[model samples]
Target chain A: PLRLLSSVHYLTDGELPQLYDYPDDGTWLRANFISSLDGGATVDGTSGAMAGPGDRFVFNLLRELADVIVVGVGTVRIEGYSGVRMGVVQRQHRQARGQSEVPQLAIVTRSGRLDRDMAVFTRTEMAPLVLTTTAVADDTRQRLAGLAEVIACSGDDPGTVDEAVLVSQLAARGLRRILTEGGPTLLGTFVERDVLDELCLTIAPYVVGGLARRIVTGPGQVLTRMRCAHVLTDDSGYLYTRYVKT
Target chain B: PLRLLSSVHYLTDGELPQLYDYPDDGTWLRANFISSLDGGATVDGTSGAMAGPGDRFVFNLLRELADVIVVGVGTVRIEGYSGVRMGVVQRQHRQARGQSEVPQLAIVTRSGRLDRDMAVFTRTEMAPLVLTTTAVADDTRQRLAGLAEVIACSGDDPGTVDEAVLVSQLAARGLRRILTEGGPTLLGTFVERDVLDELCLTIAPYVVGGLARRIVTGPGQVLTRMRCAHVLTDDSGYLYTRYVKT
Candidate 1:
């Protein structure tokens, strides 16, 4: 092991470890993603094939740390994210760290056309949260309101969910420690509004060559500068890099 | 500094550091690339903005170690790659390591519609090499033949360059230590043919949210699994990762 960088080498490989001391800011929104060597976030349809064991470990760790897990409803549909499930060990770890036993699963959508029968709402210990737009139908809102805390992000044009208002609303509800497991377009909105505070990107050791979408994709260019906080790696060559807003 | 996952931390921050020991399997092909944290290889139309100081350092270092630099002619035109120019310090470093003072410039094209008058051909110390299909126009071939060695990568269907055959021909000429700075589509072909031996990728700490393409873009679904060789970090939070074909 060598501290071969500027001041020191932060995060590394071992049996027992202390997690990186992330910032304790009041309203922090972190996004976690994994991409292949050539930058494809998914292999076929999901990021599962590109993720290694180490990435999965951190994936659970991030969910364990967050107060609420935010994601695109489309991501929920594609990834089959049914509630934020935690094993007994993970729950114990979260409780030991003074966090909730299970974080709330929050879905972002404009249509409010979610599967009410999905286990994310029906099977979870806590009621899920829905962040939708004012353009959603009153019936759709009423349908989802019965299942979860419905927050129609106001102050944006009808049919659109403004990223700034959404984050502020989540923070207003005391769910300040937000973590987004992206399907790209949702993260693109956060990036566009410059609300993403931290990014935990896992670089997997694989190459998926095709016209696959990247980890952040949308219309206009949203440029946001960040600073590297820590770098973590595993035996499998999966690189877990943490970046905070500069 | 902590080693938290595996055997040792390969590359970190410090003084008098040694570069990661890469494999030299006689005929090796390495690809070097940089991308934004969200996987945008190019912020604008070129990758220049996404590159940082550490990335530039490794960019030159790869050139210093390679016997030849292979690139797409489209990249040559887009990036305005004139010639392989090295500074006095880099020249001394290459000489001290017993490498050529400047590596040869190799251009790959299918239509052979390249500008022979480009400085990469006329101003370089060593004449560049053009790898093209046999179906290139006689006039176009004759135009480039005067300034570079026109190695028509034969045995493919007319109007197309078989990536495997191209590498084999270059290997036949003993120019094996190949480093490709991509135009994505070309790198896609290499990955598709399963001839890419290694990939050197740099992840810049920024988000360029747009419909930007990944570092590898092609028509086919080429699935190639690679193992991480090493990870290097800098003060700028640029993660320089090397991956070897598994």
Candidate 2:
């Protein structure tokens, strides 16, 4: 059972959903990540090794709440990305809330070198959105044509994606409730651009000592003040913490 | 106020001390560290920027409970080394518990190049212990002689200190309740040797995105399983989490 420890509210497992209700006033971007006790983002090469039951629950719950689930291409390939799947009950709940049956999967890439035969392109309930730059090769764009909506959110720089432009483009597409499942670099861009609205971090109880990447790995320091919205812990000793940008 | 959230206990500020009481059965080595929400161990090359009031409270409280505080020389220089000090009430409390007036400060070094005039050597209270290697120069040993107790814990290798030998030496000196304020590399050594019994991590609520060192950094991955003992959070949103090796 999950127990809430934040000063704002006292809650148990049943009432937990109330604590994570997104503010419906406007567009919001949330980033979700999990790290080991020693700050390793992944246990081997993938984050799947570090996830526990509670993490998986929250991960799915966050996806259910988002209008679009954004991610980096590196994370997609490394984590073996597929189409987002929702249970019948989950789909009904989202529909009841006037949300789509399933959130769109948006992959942020500069290269736009996605395989058409990849499960992420073929196995989805909804076609994935490919957010890339105009600098991508014409042949690569053609390959992604029917598989996903190719949206160019950057200029000639294939190495860079304008996070502000990307967010605006997603907002224009009515994907306001954004949830970015980062593999460090993508989250770094969001953080660097100061466009992140909230952060949901799950800290696993394992001391993984190594040169693993952190949740936000990039050049330069961006010290963003965040107010802890809530802290929840389960029987398995995983900490699920929420922080809103202040 | 600190609110304890763990399967073991539920506590408010006054009862929080009970949540962190050391196991008196035998020797224990605990590591204490603070990191940003993005997993950066320091901000602007110092951890002080990331520390909140709750972190300071637990830091001092952990020191009060330890028999000796071990640290890497790099941390000593970076964090500015100084002799440990305790208030009159704190000292009296330790005395009542049949403990020393203050915990001894132990600095681990390979080069043994600490200056004699440093505040750590000249400050009030007990002399700091310099745990170095026999490979250090005779002149350096002579310089550290009157300033601190220079004990060689390693042999021919001037670059390495055997963590097992270091722990045994500390145990021999009756410093059973050990606390290592790691600078990453030092904690990495203890982790590599599998000597770390517990970890007290303070998660500061700030997204400091930088290439700062983690609390544990080393060559190889050592996945140490830990059981969460307790998690406490204050109004400032700093999380004080304790994990014991399973």
Candidate 3:
């Protein structure tokens, strides 16, 4: 069972929604990731092997509470991300809260290169929004027209998508509660732009000794001060931590 | 205040010593490290910035519990380590427990290329043990003769010190309780050899986004199955976790 480690208030898996409640009036960007004890972001080139039962519970819970889920194209390919799924009861609960039954998927890319047969395009409940640069070929944009809404997020840089533009575009579309399941570089971009509001990190109890990537990898350092909101732990020794920008 | 998160047993800072008690008979190898929420092993090229009050308390406690503290030569230079210091009361307690006043420091190196001016050789309570390769220059070994006890742990490898030889040499000297405050590669060596008994990891509540190194970095992967021993957290949001090999 999951228990709150930083607070005296008792916590059940059901009450976790109340504890992670966010304001509806503003745009908030939260990045969630899981890392091993030796600071490895993935095991065997994917994060699925690192996650336990408690981590999976929080992972799904975060998705349930978001307005839209943002991700990098690299993560989509490596983790084999599919559509966001919601049970009947969960969909009803979300609809009752004045939210869409399921959150929309937003994939961030620079080259606008996406396979038409990928699960993200074919199997998703809702058509995903592809955030890319203006320099992408017209043919590529037209190819994804039927599958996803391709939006140019950067006009100045041909090979780069501006993080601010991505957030602003999403905010214009009522995607205020944003959650980015990063592939490191995307989270680094959010951190570099000083747009990340909160971070939900889960530390797995395993030591994967090797040259695996970290949770945030980029060119230079971005030191952001954050205040710990709460910490939760399960019987499996996974630490669920919440940190909000200070 | 620090509270136990894994078990119902109440924990105080003073009582942490009792909870971390290990059998005095076996040669147990434990590694201790601090990392950021983003999986960074250090901040500003050293681990001092990543540590909080709770982490410092546990760091000192582990040193007191160990018979000898092993560290990589790289960490000795980068962290600027000094001799282990024990308070009057703590030294008395350790002496009463049939342990040394302070744990001996053992530096692992392959090239035996230590500077004569480093504090590990100049200023120390007890002479440090330099575990290097037999390929070290005769003059280099003679230079450190007056400063530290130079022992070659590997003869076949010209640029590597065998982990097995290092452990056996320490055990032969009646130094059983081992704690390695790693600089990543050293811990990777032990993990590669499958000699690590326990890992005491402290998760600092900070997100350092960059190309910082992980806690374990080497050429190949070594997946070690471990069981969670305990999880402790403090008001400062640092998680002190213990995992023992299964």
* Most DockQ-accurate candidate: 1
Model 3 scores a C-alpha lDDT of 0.81
- Residue A7 C-alpha lDDT in model 2: 39
> For residues A111-159, could you state the per-residue lDDT of candidate 3 as single tens digits?
7888888888989998888888877735557988788888778746766
lDDT of 2 by residue, A20-79 (tens): 777776678999999989898988888988887788988998898888999999999899
DockQ of candidate 3 against the true complex: 0.42
Count clashing residue pairs per candidate: 14, 0, 0
Model 2 superposed RMSD (Cα): 3.9
lDDT of 3 by residue, B13-67 (tens): 4578765676668788899999888888888898988787778888988999888
In TM-score terms, candidate 3 sits at 0.90
**lDDT against the true structure, each candidate:** 0.78, 0.82, 0.81
User: Lowest-scoring 10 consecutive residues by lDDT in candidate 3 chain B?
Assistant: B1-10
TM-score between model 2 and native: 0.91
RMSD list, candidates in order: 3.6, 3.9, 3.7
Give the poorly placed runs of model 1, Cα more than 4 Å off.
A1-25, A96-98, B1-25, B93-98, B137-139, B156-158
Q: What is the TM-score of each candidate against the true structure?
A: 0.90, 0.91, 0.90
State the lDDT at B200 in candidate 2: 92
Candidate 2 lDDT score at position A237 = 76
